[PDB]
Amino acid sequence: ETRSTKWYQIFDTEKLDDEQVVGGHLALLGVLGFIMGIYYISGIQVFPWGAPGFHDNWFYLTIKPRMVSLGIDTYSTKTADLEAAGARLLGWAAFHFLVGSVLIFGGWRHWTHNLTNPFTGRCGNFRDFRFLGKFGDVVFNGTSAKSYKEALGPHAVYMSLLFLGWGIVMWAILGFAPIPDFQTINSETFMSFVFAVIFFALGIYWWNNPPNAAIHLNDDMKAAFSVHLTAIGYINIALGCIAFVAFQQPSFAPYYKELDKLVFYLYGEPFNRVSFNFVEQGGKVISGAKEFADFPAYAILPKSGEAFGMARVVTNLIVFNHIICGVLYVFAGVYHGGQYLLKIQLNGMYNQIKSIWITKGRDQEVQVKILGTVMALCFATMLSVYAVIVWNTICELNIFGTNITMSFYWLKPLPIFQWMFADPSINDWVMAHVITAGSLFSLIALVRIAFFAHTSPLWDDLGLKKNSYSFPCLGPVYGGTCGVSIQDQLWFAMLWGIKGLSAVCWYIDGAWIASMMYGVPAADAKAWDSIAHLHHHYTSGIFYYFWTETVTIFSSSHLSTILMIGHLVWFISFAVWFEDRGSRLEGADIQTRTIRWLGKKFLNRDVNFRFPVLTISDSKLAGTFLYFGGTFMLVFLFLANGFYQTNSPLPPPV
Amino acid sequence: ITAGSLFSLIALVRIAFFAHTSPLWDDLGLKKNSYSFPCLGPVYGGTCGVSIQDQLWFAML
Amino acid sequence: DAAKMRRFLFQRTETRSTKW
Amino acid sequence: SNGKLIALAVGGAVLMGALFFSVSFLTGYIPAPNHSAILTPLRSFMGWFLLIFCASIIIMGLGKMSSAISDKWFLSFPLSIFVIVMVMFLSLRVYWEKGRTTTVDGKYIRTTAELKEFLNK
Amino acid sequence: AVSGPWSGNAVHKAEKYFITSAKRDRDGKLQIELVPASGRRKLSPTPEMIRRLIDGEIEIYILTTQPDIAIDMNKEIIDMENRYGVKWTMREIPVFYHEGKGLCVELHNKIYTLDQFFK
Amino acid sequence: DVTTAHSDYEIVLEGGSSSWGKVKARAKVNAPPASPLLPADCDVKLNVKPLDPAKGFVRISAVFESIVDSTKNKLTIEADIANETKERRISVGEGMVSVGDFSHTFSFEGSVVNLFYYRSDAVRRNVPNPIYMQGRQFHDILMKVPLDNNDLIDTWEGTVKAIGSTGAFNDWIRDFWFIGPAFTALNEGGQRISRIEVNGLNTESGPKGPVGVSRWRFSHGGSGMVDSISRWAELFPSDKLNRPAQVEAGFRSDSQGIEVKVDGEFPGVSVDAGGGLRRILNHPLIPLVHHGMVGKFNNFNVDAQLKVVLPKGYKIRYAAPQYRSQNLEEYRWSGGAYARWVEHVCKGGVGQFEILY
Amino acid sequence: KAKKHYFIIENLCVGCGLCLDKCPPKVNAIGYKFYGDVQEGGFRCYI
Ligand code: BCL
Ligand code: BCL
Ligand code: BCL
Ligand code: BCL
Ligand code: BCL
Ligand code: BCL
Ligand code: CLA
Ligand SMILES: CCCCCCCCCCCCCCCC(=O)OC[C@@H](CO[C@H]1O[C@@H](CO)[C@H](O)[C@@H](O)[C@@H]1O)OC(=O)CCCCCCCCCCCCCCC
Ligand SMILES: CCCCCCCCCCCCCCCC(=O)OC[C@H](COP(=O)(O)OC[C@@H](O)CO)OC(=O)CCCCCCCCCCCCCCC
Ligand code: SF4
Ligand SMILES: [Ca+2]
């Protein structure tokens, strides 16, 4: 039984009960409200008393088009209409501070099983309760849900109640009446009531008849938590997809498109510089030379929103965030799910489960056929599209006596699909097939976790079992067996995912994907816009993306610090991901002895430290975290450096 | 260059001194039978990259 | 077919052998 | 971790600072305008000393709390993180920068059109 | 003190011997022959070579697959393995010097003597 | 101002057939001691040297330096215990007892016999690690004390008079012997003290002066809980005592609390567990059952760290409760399950904590 | 001939399996035996 006393397994589902879970979830939404109340204070452009407000921060930019949509925030250029806005954000920040404090209190006592209220001098029961007095008695026949399946009806009801509350809040406090026309914010109140009716009706149908689907999920907390995470990740991916199409619709122009017209002063952006011999005095600058001379010394300079393209930068920062997470949660749902499939194969409950979500893949025969189809389709697609990108790169670089005429410029999405793209081009045919190939690639590591958590067609051949989920390897036997556990297969899903997770970043930043080299001053790189009649001028090619996008990163003293830090973090993953763990263990031994010897000779007292070294499974953990965190600490710079795609194409240089 | 030499010199002093045995493997009671053996397996938190061919790689890297 | 399959992995092992 | 162990670190830092200060009186470098000869080396050493000292305390501090965290930190750790984030945003508006960008006259510029006009004239 | 890794076997910290046969004579005395790990010479546990064991210059061990070990080692070994391929497990028992009885094997928290231990 | 107690533990073991282990323990407790008199402080020292390894004799020493309510109290013992047979064990030793301005010396010739009510092969075969062993012990005592003080002379007479006039002396002596809550402790550990038997109470002249000489016998039975009976062979690693072994400890107590300091090496810390696996010796049950007697009076939060250091090449096969952290050779226990087991065993629980290396 | 015999000393083995790959695949003599986490010497080889 492999050790589970690690600091990052303290809050595992094994160590918590259903009552503690509720307490844990509540103990965070209260913190989340405290966080949400800080993203509101920071967004005050001018204080209520008249003192100047806070400089633009990315944490408030991604929510500003929403607070403008709800009327809490305004885009007004006048201070009088910008002084009221500040008072409102204070109201909702203080309000979220109060409600957050209640949820933390109702999470601390929930976590400690201490459900006693002083005013009523009576302790409630978690096993059975009326639910908000008479309201629940009429709907749940005076009883509470006894299982996860029976919790669907009551849980659905709660959702209907929350929706109804949001609708009442928009009508009474925000003044948006429910008019059912889908070009105004007033339609978010109308559908807040339609959804509250669907869910309440759906929440009663599931209470009277609890669902029998996935009956085994009731038995284990991690089994249900993982199916929810495989579902929440897909939902989050869908939210990212929907927010990209919607945030740049004509109906969303008053909130997203309006950002272009404003002047933003982000912290860490270029500021008015000064001469080396600068001596600033209160009244005036003396014997000093200061740049611009329009602002005070060391004052952040303005930035034209239109040049920056802030409407698409903010759309990307939100769209990518709910996709970088959506795919992380799909990966974790399979991981924490296969983490539960290891236990049912170890204690042997697998062959007796009648669920077709476990019974369908019982036989190894089908497993190889299912994995052999994901593997064959990934090969026939990651090759068909890579050879197109490589061929397009060769044709435009005039390598091997070829020209941009012989390239895949005539290949584009079919007419049936053309509605999916504003401007159809080979850049769109490639992106669809890259995501298809990028999904089937990281799906291989996921089908492995689902099917080979304990035994594989090869290990059953080699007479071996995978006793744990976090075992690095079985030694150098059979030429080597490293990276065979499902935790390692999770790492190879996160690592392989970085490609499709980058085909999104590139494709939403208006870059070219149909060629490694687009827009460089070479033989046919600048002949794309006219060979294919592109209505837009994409910022750069896959490789030339790094050169162009970084002209704005190097100009910023903070975006460049991220570039440095992000690169420093990423290569350090090589130290713990290379097969040098044995070398590190020896080296440290020399360091402990060396330090002991130095202390001994140098000081009469002898002091030793016994330097520690991480384990492989503990190495592949810190390895993926340093590789993934480093790889997307810098993807932020591509999105936050500006959106530099243009609607004017380039004529051939000739 | 002084730091860059002393860094890759560590991997070289280990090839010269720990080709067959090291203070750690004499402690762990192990023999480095070979110059191109990858690891001894997961054992002792693992012992990958311990041969002199691997120490050559960590000098080139 | 296990044996025949193992004769191969054994044909590509971490032990001493002749290499090109 | 007492007496000479911490005594040694202070002695080493003092020795490095003295060496950095001493080397300059013979390095033969022209000083920057309105700067003292003794101050330039002292300021540079303090910045160098802080970077290693900050890196060292962070490495042992993370290590100390990686093996000393449990179920009891369920509320304290999330509250402490929020408190640090909060004392940080206040610093942005109380130490790092006082108020939003304003001109010498005290006027504001919040529009691209207002900016464009400013750029031209 | 102790010889270096280069002298003799490197894995060993002290020289290693294995009791290879424990036949008895006409009088029933236990004739113990122990050969070293290298294995090219045959020795018996004389006082001079026991005297090395007092100072830890050598170490003596017995395999559990010995033809004449007398005690039913396989059953006990099989039981412990089951507690936490099971059959074919082999172990090396570290023989120690007891001043009162000479060479004894602390097997399963119960001291034994080579004559008591072997057939 | 919260009942909180802090403690640190440490066990270092050698490889091979060696049973030698180094144990260090420090503790700090914030509740008042269950002692009708405070402050009470105490330092104890125990040293065992290999006097005669050939015959099987060792020289054990014990010094007790305790100040109780400003009253200096000393007890000193020097004895020669050796293994006679599997059930008999003879000890020859001298000691001195000093309280304030009073002191008296004593010499003893004693043997202890230990028998198990049954010895069955099936129990040995089917139970790999037995804990509970039903038995009885018999002590032969020949006490000899020089009566050079008036106070010592008076105690010598009264006893003879009491024996002469009271028929129930063998029974009512158990009440005097186990002073304070010591008598209650008897029932608590499932230990029965049988009636003492006086072979003789004769005054024999000595060169210094009249010397009181006593030759008594007694017995006591353990339901299995008692470690002296259940573990008779394991508490005397005489044959494993190649080098002198010493255990040194001390404690300070008063209204504010207890601070305890314990350290020392001795064999028997590691015992064979079967299948080539070694294991830390089973916790003594009598100390836990005896501490639950005073440890259940104040609610507390535990802060205990148990650092275990193993030999080179030696790795744990299994532990419950599992070690919080593993710094290779040295393993650590703190928090979570282990803090749950410490609160268990500090209040009298005897739940098993196994380590197999 | 079956004159000489070969064995694993289980307390010494680290389970690297270098021995297992020298055994002919049609004679599957050496094999693996699991009882714990591999990072803690939880596996060994046996003939
Ligand atoms: C990062 C890639 C994987 C991932 C890989 C792992 C790994 C690897 C481990 C866990 C483990 C845990 N995971 Mg997971 N897990 C992910 C996503 C999630 C999400 C989510 C936000 O949707 C949740 C709620 C969980 C839930 C949990 C718990 C069941 C369990 C213990 C948590 C703990 O103590 O953290 C540490 C507690 C803290 C206070 C530190 C901060 C943690 C913050 C709050 C984030 C929680 C999720 C995060 C991945 C936890 C592990 C951090 C480690 C450094 C890997 N995982 C993604 C999908 N998860 C452990 C386990 O027992 O699995 C069976 C384990 O070993
Ligand atoms: C406490 C449980 C038992 C007990 C347990 C034993 C054991 C066990 C044995 C003796 C044996 C003896 N007992 Mg008794 N004995 C008890 C009650 C008594 C009483 C009494 C006042 O009622 C008397 C007069 C005696 C008298 C005697 C002696 C004749 C003899 C040797 C004692 C000695 O040298 O101590 C030395 C003086 C001391 C103060 C030592 C105290 C040691 C404490 C109890 C434990 C320390 C060890 C520590 C846990 C680990 C240390 C390792 C270091 C290497 C030392 N016993 C009770 C009933 N007795 C011994 C014998 O067999 O003789 C042939 C022996 O082996
Ligand atoms: C709950 C923890 C925190 C909290 C954290 C947050 C977070 C986080 C956010 C807000 C945001 C908002 N909060 Mg707040 N907020 C809290 C308490 C409140 C209370 C209150 C009644 O006390 C009010 C009136 C508000 C008010 C508001 C608005 C100013 C604003 C927009 C809300 C919105 O769109 O709602 C709409 C809400 C509903 C329609 C309720 C239904 C939500 C459903 C259940 C989720 C379904 C999504 C997905 C598809 C799930 C599918 C799975 C199943 C099939 C359902 N908060 C507490 C203190 N607040 C938002 C913001 O600032 O945006 C910029 C925001 O994102
Ligand atoms: C937002 C509030 C949080 C929450 C925070 C608190 C707080 C705050 C308290 C409790 C406490 C109690 N919790 Mg709770 N708890 C939540 C969810 C639940 C659920 C559930 C699965 O739905 C159940 C069965 C319980 C059970 C219980 C009660 C038995 C207990 C009663 C003492 C008291 O003051 O009671 C009054 C409540 C009842 C008698 C139970 C019936 C009414 C409902 C279920 C109470 C929770 C708030 C309600 C859902 C909020 C509005 C939802 C709208 C959609 C906005 N909680 C909700 C979602 N919990 C008490 C405690 O811990 O005291 C130390 C307490 O004061
Ligand atoms: C000439 C055929 C081209 C091709 C040209 C197109 C065109 C044109 C369109 C798509 C589009 C799509 N393609 Mg394609 N596509 C090919 C191969 C694939 C493979 C694959 C790995 O086999 C996959 C998973 C996809 C996936 C997809 C979806 C994203 C979408 C679905 C409709 C569609 O294909 O309609 C049309 C489909 C066909 C006319 C016939 C499909 C034939 C099947 C796929 C067999 C070909 C696979 C082949 C064996 C791979 C060679 C591997 C070798 C063995 C080395 N394509 C081959 C390389 N694809 C649409 C889209 O939205 O693009 C943005 C679209 O308009
Ligand atoms: C609130 C819960 C607290 C707690 C509450 C208390 C309280 C309250 C008290 C103690 C007491 C003690 N605690 Mg505590 N204690 C806690 C946890 C600990 C921890 C730890 C964290 O590991 C430690 C090391 C200790 C240690 C100790 C000792 C210092 C002390 C008992 C001494 C003893 O053994 O007398 C051994 C006693 C004897 C052997 C009996 C002597 C007299 C009898 C008549 C002799 C007959 C035997 C016979 C003669 C023997 C053999 C003779 C030979 C064979 C010759 N406690 C917990 C956390 N503890 C008690 C104490 O005494 O404090 C001063 C006390 O009152
Ligand atoms: C910046 C990256 C970096 C650093 C600092 C080190 C440092 C070290 N490596 Mg490693 N290594 C790295 C990258 C790095 N390596 C990579 C990419 C690989 C993969 C090829 C390896 C592979 C590897 C092996 C295989 C081994 C090591 C070993 C060692 C140690 C022996 C050298 C020594 O004693 O002092 C060298 C001098 C110093 C460490 C001076 C300190 C330099 C700076 C100041 C360190 C602090 C900066 C740091 C990045 C701060 C992090 C900030 C955070 C935001 C990320 C040493 C601690 C050996 C060892 O003994 O392991 C313990 C060993 O066997 N290296
Ligand atoms: C990580 C592991 C795997 C990776 C996959 C995970 C991430 C997937 C997350 C979806 C990523 C989308 C991002 C935001 C949506 C967005 O962009 O939608 C708009 C539109 C173009 O909009 C405009 O974009 C401009 C930018 O340059 C252009 O210039 C312009 O001409 C064009 O009109 O894009 C599509 O139509 C989407 C294409 C992909 C088509 C999907 C095909 C997949 C469907 C089939 C099966 C796939 C799954 C296989 C099973 C695993
Ligand atoms: C005078 C000196 C005498 C003898 C020489 C002394 C040697 C001195 C040794 C100093 C050590 C060098 C210092 C670092 C040297 C160095 O770089 O080594 C990298 C390090 C190597 O550690 P090892 O396990 O090899 O052992 C290191 C020690 O033995 C050092 O002696 O790997 C990691 O830290 C990965 C874990 C990161 C945790 C994952 C976090 C993921 C989140 C992503 C973002 C996080 C941002 C920040 C996170 C922190
Ligand atoms: S280097 Fe690491 S992954 Fe490779 S065989 Fe050795 S332990 Fe396994
Ligand atoms: Ca860009």
Side-chain angles (χ1 to χ4, degrees), chain A residues 218-421:
Chain A
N218 298 283
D219 298 4
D220 210 14
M221 179 178 300
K222 186 179 280 317
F225 154 79
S226 74
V227 178
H228 279 186
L229 204 42
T230 310
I232 279 295
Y234 277 116
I235 281 165
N236 221 15
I237 290 168
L239 295 174
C241 277
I242 287 158
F244 186 74
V245 189
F247 286 175
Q248 57 189 357
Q249 281 300 311
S251 58
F252 286 73
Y255 322 108
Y256 283 92
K257 175 166 165 58
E258 189 75 31
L259 274 168
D260 301 336
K261 302 162 170 46
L262 314 161
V263 160
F264 309 87
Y265 306 102
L266 275 66
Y267 290 101
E269 295 302 320
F271 64 89
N272 182 347
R273 288 171 281 183
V274 288
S275 67
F276 305 116
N277 64 341
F278 196 70
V279 174
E280 182 186 3
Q281 199 203 30
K284 207 81 65 183
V285 290
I286 322 172
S287 71
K290 76 170 184 190
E291 193 193 28
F292 286 98
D294 295 309
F295 307 101
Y298 322 104
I300 312 300
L301 295 174
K303 159 176 299 192
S304 159
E306 182 48 50
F308 200 65
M310 188 85 54
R312 189 81 166 242
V313 175
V314 159
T315 292
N316 289 341
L317 280 196
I318 294 149
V319 161
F320 200 72
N321 178 68
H322 285 70
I323 294 194
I324 186 71
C325 300
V327 175
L328 274 188
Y329 292 161
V330 170
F331 292 168
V334 190
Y335 167 63
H336 293 114
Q339 205 169 0
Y340 156 88
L341 268 288
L342 196 45
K343 181 182 62 60
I344 81 171
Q345 290 164 311
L346 283 184
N347 57 34
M349 311 207 294
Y350 182 97
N351 277 8
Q352 302 151 33
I353 298 190
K354 296 278 192 175
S355 178
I356 80 178
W357 287 98
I358 303 301
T359 299
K360 212 69 205 167
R362 192 149 288 158
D363 56 318
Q364 214 159 53
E365 183 65 13
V366 301
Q367 292 189 4
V368 172
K369 287 184 193 193
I370 296 169
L371 193 42
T373 308
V374 173
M375 185 179 288
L377 288 164
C378 174
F379 168 79
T381 307
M382 171 171 303
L383 188 147
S384 291
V385 74
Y386 188 60
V388 163
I389 300 157
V390 171
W391 184 237
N392 285 350
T393 303
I394 282 164
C395 297
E396 76 172 21
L397 272 191
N398 300 19
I399 309 287
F400 308 125
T402 54
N403 57 351
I404 198 150
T405 290
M406 292 177 72
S407 74
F408 283 107
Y409 77 93
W410 64 268
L411 177 75
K412 64 179 180 180
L414 290 188
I416 307 179
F417 297 90
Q418 282 173 346
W419 67 266
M420 293 177 70
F421 308 107

